[PDB]
Amino acid sequence: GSISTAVIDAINSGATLKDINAIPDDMMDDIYSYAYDFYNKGRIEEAEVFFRFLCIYDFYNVDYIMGLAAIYQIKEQFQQAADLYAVAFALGKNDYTPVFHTGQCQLRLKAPLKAKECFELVIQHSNDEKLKIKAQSYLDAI
Amino acid sequence: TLKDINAIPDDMMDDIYSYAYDFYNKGRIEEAEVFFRFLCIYDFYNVDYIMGLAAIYQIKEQFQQAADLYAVAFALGKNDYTPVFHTGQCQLRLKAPLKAKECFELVIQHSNDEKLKIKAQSYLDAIQ
Ligand SMILES: Fc1ccc(C2=NNC3=NCCN3C2)cc1F
Ligand SMILES: [Cl-]
Ligand SMILES: [Cl-]
Ligand SMILES: [Mg+2]
């Protein structure tokens, strides 16, 4: 998957496609928009390929990671989704949306203590009042 | 992964990790790097294996490579902010002090590791 690719790239430490500027920003932006065209039409399998392609080129991009994580959550691949949401959070320190979704995934993974920690982080640190209500509704049910 | 098919026994993998750390502690960086690369090929999803290779890259002043691995290590472990602390150090070396500040702030806001937070605060205090 995307994470294994990132680690292999790191182990081998060779020239990556991004390191050589193999695809310009404008083209990457276009491909990202195409990925969501597929996604928005329910063509989740094509969208997944396009987001995997984006994540091979530039894994450390919050927008690419969040798109792929969303697909895995929809497909009920909850551990892969949680792992990617956690990457997205590390890259995007100030957005607690990936932490909220990690909590949802942890609940489906039968890990309520991890989920509780996620939802509590949202309540204590997010400035998104609507996200906080949603996190509290999950907390109330745990 | 090779771990998924149990290609090497568990006890032998523990030995190899301990040998990797022995090389690391003795300053035998080239050998530790081989051993941590071996471990990460065997199980890319082992946070401690990733952290070891990331540490080697940081010592070698390959700061971006280290930060990239620390991001994966953080994600897999979810609740351990040690990789975030080391990323902050890497960002300082990469002349990205605002990114470093965000890393150290994240450690202090989320971590339950008091000794780690003391270290993070000492870096924050020094950031201009
Ligand atoms: F906690 C972390 C926060 C950011 C990063 C990062 N690593 N690598 C990286 N490449 C482009 C942006 N970016 C941030 C790693 C962490 F471990
Ligand atoms: Cl937020
Ligand atoms: Cl900066
Ligand atoms: Mg608040």
Side-chain angles (χ1 to χ4, degrees), chain B residues 91 94-100:
Chain B
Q91 295 292 7
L94 290 163
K95 304 303 182 184
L98 298 185
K99 300 182 190 164

mmCIF file of all heavy atoms in Angstrom, chain B residues 91 94-101, ligand 3, unseen atoms left out:
data_model
loop_
_atom_site.group_PDB
_atom_site.id
_atom_site.type_symbol
_atom_site.label_atom_id
_atom_site.label_comp_id
_atom_site.label_asym_id
_atom_site.label_seq_id
_atom_site.Cartn_x
_atom_site.Cartn_y
_atom_site.Cartn_z
ATOM 1 N N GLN B 91 13.347 19.663 11.642
ATOM 2 C CA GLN B 91 12.903 20.903 11.007
ATOM 3 C C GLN B 91 13.808 22.073 11.374
ATOM 4 O O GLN B 91 14.091 22.933 10.528
ATOM 5 C CB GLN B 91 11.445 21.201 11.370
ATOM 6 C CG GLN B 91 10.440 20.170 10.831
ATOM 7 C CD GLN B 91 10.298 20.182 9.305
ATOM 8 O OE1 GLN B 91 11.036 20.867 8.596
ATOM 9 N NE2 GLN B 91 9.340 19.409 8.801
ATOM 10 N N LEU B 94 16.699 21.879 9.179
ATOM 11 C CA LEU B 94 16.294 22.231 7.821
ATOM 12 C C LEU B 94 15.921 23.701 7.681
ATOM 13 O O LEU B 94 15.392 24.097 6.635
ATOM 14 C CB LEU B 94 15.116 21.353 7.377
ATOM 15 C CG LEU B 94 15.434 19.873 7.125
ATOM 16 C CD1 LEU B 94 14.164 19.027 7.093
ATOM 17 C CD2 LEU B 94 16.215 19.708 5.821
ATOM 18 N N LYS B 95 16.158 24.506 8.719
ATOM 19 C CA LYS B 95 15.883 25.944 8.694
ATOM 20 C C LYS B 95 14.395 26.220 8.494
ATOM 21 O O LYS B 95 13.998 27.137 7.770
ATOM 22 C CB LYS B 95 16.728 26.648 7.629
ATOM 23 C CG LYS B 95 18.219 26.410 7.802
ATOM 24 C CD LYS B 95 18.690 26.840 9.190
ATOM 25 C CE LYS B 95 20.188 26.636 9.338
ATOM 26 N NZ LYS B 95 20.709 26.948 10.701
ATOM 27 N N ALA B 96 13.561 25.427 9.170
ATOM 28 C CA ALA B 96 12.106 25.561 9.129
ATOM 29 C C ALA B 96 11.606 25.723 10.563
ATOM 30 O O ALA B 96 10.937 24.829 11.100
ATOM 31 C CB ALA B 96 11.459 24.356 8.455
ATOM 32 N N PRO B 97 11.935 26.845 11.218
ATOM 33 C CA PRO B 97 11.625 26.977 12.656
ATOM 34 C C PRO B 97 10.142 27.036 12.978
ATOM 35 O O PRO B 97 9.754 26.670 14.099
ATOM 36 C CB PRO B 97 12.329 28.282 13.050
ATOM 37 C CG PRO B 97 12.378 29.070 11.768
ATOM 38 C CD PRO B 97 12.598 28.047 10.685
ATOM 39 N N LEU B 98 9.305 27.547 12.073
ATOM 40 C CA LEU B 98 7.871 27.577 12.348
ATOM 41 C C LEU B 98 7.274 26.177 12.293
ATOM 42 O O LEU B 98 6.384 25.845 13.083
ATOM 43 C CB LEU B 98 7.160 28.512 11.372
ATOM 44 C CG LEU B 98 7.590 29.978 11.439
ATOM 45 C CD1 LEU B 98 6.718 30.813 10.512
ATOM 46 C CD2 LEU B 98 7.531 30.504 12.864
ATOM 47 N N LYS B 99 7.748 25.342 11.364
ATOM 48 C CA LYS B 99 7.341 23.942 11.368
ATOM 49 C C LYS B 99 7.839 23.234 12.623
ATOM 50 O O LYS B 99 7.113 22.427 13.218
ATOM 51 C CB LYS B 99 7.864 23.234 10.115
ATOM 52 C CG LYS B 99 7.366 23.830 8.795
ATOM 53 C CD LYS B 99 7.913 23.028 7.610
ATOM 54 C CE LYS B 99 7.639 23.719 6.281
ATOM 55 N NZ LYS B 99 8.483 23.135 5.203
ATOM 56 N N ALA B 100 9.077 23.509 13.035
ATOM 57 C CA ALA B 100 9.588 22.899 14.257
ATOM 58 C C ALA B 100 8.736 23.295 15.455
ATOM 59 O O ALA B 100 8.392 22.447 16.285
ATOM 60 C CB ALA B 100 11.045 23.301 14.480
ATOM 61 N N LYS B 101 8.384 24.579 15.555
ATOM 62 C CA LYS B 101 7.563 25.038 16.668
ATOM 63 C C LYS B 101 6.257 24.260 16.733
ATOM 64 O O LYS B 101 5.841 23.811 17.810
ATOM 65 C CB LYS B 101 7.301 26.540 16.513
ATOM 66 C CG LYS B 101 6.480 27.188 17.604
ATOM 67 C CD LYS B 101 6.437 28.695 17.376
ATOM 68 C CE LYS B 101 5.401 29.375 18.262
HETATM 69 CL CL CL C 3 9.243 27.422 8.843
#
